[PDB]
Amino acid sequence: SRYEHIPGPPGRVLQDVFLDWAKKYGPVVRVNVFHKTSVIVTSPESVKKFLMSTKYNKDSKMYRALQTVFGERLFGQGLVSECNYERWHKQRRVIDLAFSRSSLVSLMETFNEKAEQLVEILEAKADGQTPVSMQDMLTYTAMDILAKAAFGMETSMLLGAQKPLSQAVKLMLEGITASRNKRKQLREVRESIRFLRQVGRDWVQRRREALKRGEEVPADILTQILKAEEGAQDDEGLLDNFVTFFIAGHETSANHLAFTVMELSRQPEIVARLQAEVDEVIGSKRYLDFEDLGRLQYLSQVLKESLRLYPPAWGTFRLLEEETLIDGVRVPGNTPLLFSTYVMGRMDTYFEDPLTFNPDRFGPGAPKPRFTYFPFSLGHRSCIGQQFAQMEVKVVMAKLLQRLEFRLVPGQRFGLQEQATLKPLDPVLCTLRPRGW
Numbered sequence: 001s002r003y004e005h006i007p008g009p010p011g012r013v014l015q016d017v018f019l020d021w022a023k024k025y026g027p028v029v030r031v032n033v034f035h036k037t038s039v040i041v042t043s044p045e046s047v048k049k050f051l052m053s054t055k056y057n058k059d060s061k062m063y064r065a066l067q068t069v070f071g072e073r074l075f076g077q078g079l080v081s082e083c084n085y086e087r088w089h090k091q092r093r094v095i096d097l098a099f100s101r102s103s104l105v106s107l108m109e110t111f112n113e114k115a116e117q118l119v120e121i122l123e124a125k126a127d128g129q130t131p132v133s134m135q136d137m138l139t140y141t142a143m144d145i146l147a148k149a150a151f152g153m154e155t156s157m158l159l160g161a162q163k164p165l166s167q168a169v170k171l172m173l174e175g176i177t178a179s180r181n182k183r184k185q186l187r188e189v190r191e192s193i194r195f196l197r198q199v200g201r202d203w204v205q206r207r208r209e210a211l212k213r214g215e216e217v218p219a220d221i222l223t224q225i226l227k228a229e230e231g232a233q234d235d236e237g238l239l240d241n242f243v244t245f246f247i248a249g250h251e252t253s254a255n256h257l258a259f260t261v262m263e264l265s266r267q268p269e270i271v272a273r274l275q276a277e278v279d280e281v282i283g284s285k286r287y288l289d290f291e292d293l294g295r296l297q298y299l300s301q302v303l304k305e306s307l308r309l310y311p312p313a314w315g316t317f318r319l320l321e322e323e324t325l326i327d328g329v330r331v332p333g334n335t336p337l338l339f340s341t342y343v344m345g346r347m348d349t350y351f352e353d354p355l356t357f358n359p360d361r362f363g364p365g366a367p368k369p370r371f372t373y374f375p376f377s378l379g380h381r382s383c384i385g386q387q388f389a390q391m392e393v394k395v396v397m398a399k400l401l402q403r404l405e406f407r408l409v410p411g412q413r414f415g416l417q418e419q420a421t422l423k424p425l426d427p428v429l430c431t432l433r434p435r436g437w
């Protein structure tokens with residue numbers, strides 16, 4: 001009864017239903033998400049008010065399925081799932097040192113080496129007939145980049161290594177999804193989460209032994225995760241952030257690459273423009289320097305437009321503590337507010353011809369979306385990995401565009417699925433040819 005007065009109803013995802021309801025019932029709508037009543041707020045005035053203030057914190061109840069799944073601690077109180085401002089701020093300021101401009105410049109060698117490994121694997125299959133799952137290959141690439149860049153470890157998923165780890169990630173993602181929506185599935189999810197935390201324990205002990213033996217350890221994300229727990233009572237906070245960064249640092253990047261390859265397979269004119277830009281900026285060069293990234297201006301526009309239609313992370317929640325009038329609607333206190341870049345990106349009120357893929361929306365002369373577009377969120381709880389992700393994805397896409405042509409296999413769909421994140425429904429099965437052919 002406390003929400004009954006709020007407007008709302010008497011390869012698709014629940015986000016599409018929410019879009020239909022936002023269009024029909026307006027900027028403040030009652031919905032059920034993760035088994036809880038919430039209110040989706042889709043005005044840019046509400047996005048600005050609630051996301052750009054430290055007054056409004058995340059609603060912990062809407063992060064329970066990241067904290068713990070089926071009684072197994074997962075992300076716990078790591079950087080994503082910690083909803084107490086002062087406990088979040090302490091870890092954020094320490095882990096931020098690993099995402100400095102200087103830190104990220106030093107990662108270009110890892111980005112380039114894993115992107116080059118992926119394109120050599122794909123060029124050997126580029127016979128115009130062998131079907132290749134681009135969603136699988138891009139996920140292996142993202143995992144190998146993350147493991148190396150963040151932890152100094154070689155997963156070698158591009159070589160077919162670490163299949164139990166790959167299985168553990170997939171079952172954990174299925175567990176998050178099932179928790180927010182029997183005996184075998186419980187056992188498999190629970191053992192997968194323990195496996196991932198045990199990977200953390202093993203790799204933290206490997207790093208600690210290296211430091212005690214006096215070996216060279218390059219400062220990385222893991223250095224700062226350890227620094228954040230200096231003098232803590234135990235290792236549970238460290239393993240929360242290990243698992244947080246192990247998962248968050250590859251899954252959305254993979255999803256974003258797969259969506260971009262999927263959408264570009266039906267945009268031959270935009271591909272011909274991207275191929276021309278990479279030819280002009282990097283030419284024959286095997287290696288992209290940091291200064292080359294800023295020169296790939298049309299690619300950066302294409303990747304922004306991909307995130308507008310296909311955001312892997314569709315949004316965020318804030319807790320409304322006190323009854324508040326939002327856009328002419330009385331919203332009771334202690335209510336989770338849902339913000340969706342997926343919903344707002346598909347509203348004609350905010351984007352003209354919203355289903356058209358048009359990179360010129362992000363062109364230099366174009367008016368910037370004002371609080372209608374937030375694939376990395378906004379304000380103090382925005383993605384810490386945003387610049388890491390934009391660099392690694394531009395490196396991978398630039399090297400694909402330099403070397404290969406992709407055709408989506410007929411019958412492959414453009415629809416979405418929601419696990420923990422949004423990603424293509426289908427494997428993005430393509431045939432490949434070398435450029436020139």
Ligand code: HEM
Nearest residue numbers: 079080248249252253256313316376377381383384385389
């Ligand atoms: C295209 C890629 C990515 C997208 C679309 C994305 C999106 C987002 C979004 C929407 C949030 C806000 C989540 C919330 O409010 O609950 C967020 C937070 C976060 N992301 Fe990402 N992310 C990406 C890549 C990364 C990468 C590469 C890393 C790590 C290396 C990462 C680590 C995190 C962390 C730790 C947070 C929590 C930040 C905090 O609250 O202080 N993400 N991301």
Ligand SMILES: Cc1cnn(-c2ccncc2N2CCC(C(=O)N(C)C)CC2)c1
Nearest residue numbers: 062080247248251252313315316420421
């Ligand atoms: C499990 C998982 C896989 N990838 N990520 C991810 C990657 C990078 N940056 C943010 C991410 N998450 C997306 C889920 C999102 C969530 O569950 N909310 C809002 C309730 C929180 C932020 C989390």
